Amino acid sequence: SDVYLIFSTCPDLPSAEIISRVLVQERLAACVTQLPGAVSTYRWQGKIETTQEIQLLIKTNAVHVNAAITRLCALHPYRLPEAIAVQVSVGLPEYLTWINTEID
Numbered sequence: 001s002d003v004y005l006i007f008s009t010c011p012d013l014p015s016a017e018i019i020s021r022v023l024v025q026e027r028l029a030a031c032v033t034q035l036p037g038a039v040s041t042y043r044w045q046g047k048i049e050t051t052q053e054i055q056l057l058i059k060t061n062a063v064h065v066n067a068a069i070t071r072l073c074a075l076h077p078y079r080l081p082e083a084i085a086v087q088v089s090v091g092l093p094e095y096l097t098w099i100n101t102e103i104d
Contacts, residue, residue: 003088003096004065006058009040011077016054019075028068029060030102061100062087 006029010016013036020032035055042049060068069083088096 001088001091001096002062003091003099004060004062004085005088006056006060006065006068006072006083006085008056008058008072008076008082008084009038009053010056010081011051011053013054015075015077016056019056019072022075023058023060023068023071026071027103028064028071029058030099031059033057033059059099060085061103064103 008019010019013034016034016036020034023029023032033056035057038053038055040051040053042051058068058072065085069085072083073081
């Protein structure tokens with residue numbers, strides 16, 4: 001399908017809310033789901049670091065993937081945010097249509 005799920009994380013609730021609201025308002029994503037209480041572990045210059053985060057699941061389509069990612073970046077606290085998109089293989093047809101009609 002041409003629906004894509006974009007994963008990102010943000011450091012807290014306002015950033016998640018800002019990103020979620022803006023991406024939907026600007027019709028770059030049909031919906032954004034936040035999963036709070038996430039912890040991410042990564043290296044930050046020779047140190048194992050953990051950061052509390054909100055996980056985002058951004059539902060969009062192929063023609064909006066880049067715009068959603070770049071707008072996400074424009075709104076993001078992080079200099080280099082997670083933004084990775086996975087193509088949806090198949091889905092409930094009316095749901096895929098809804099994603100598309102929301103933003104196309």
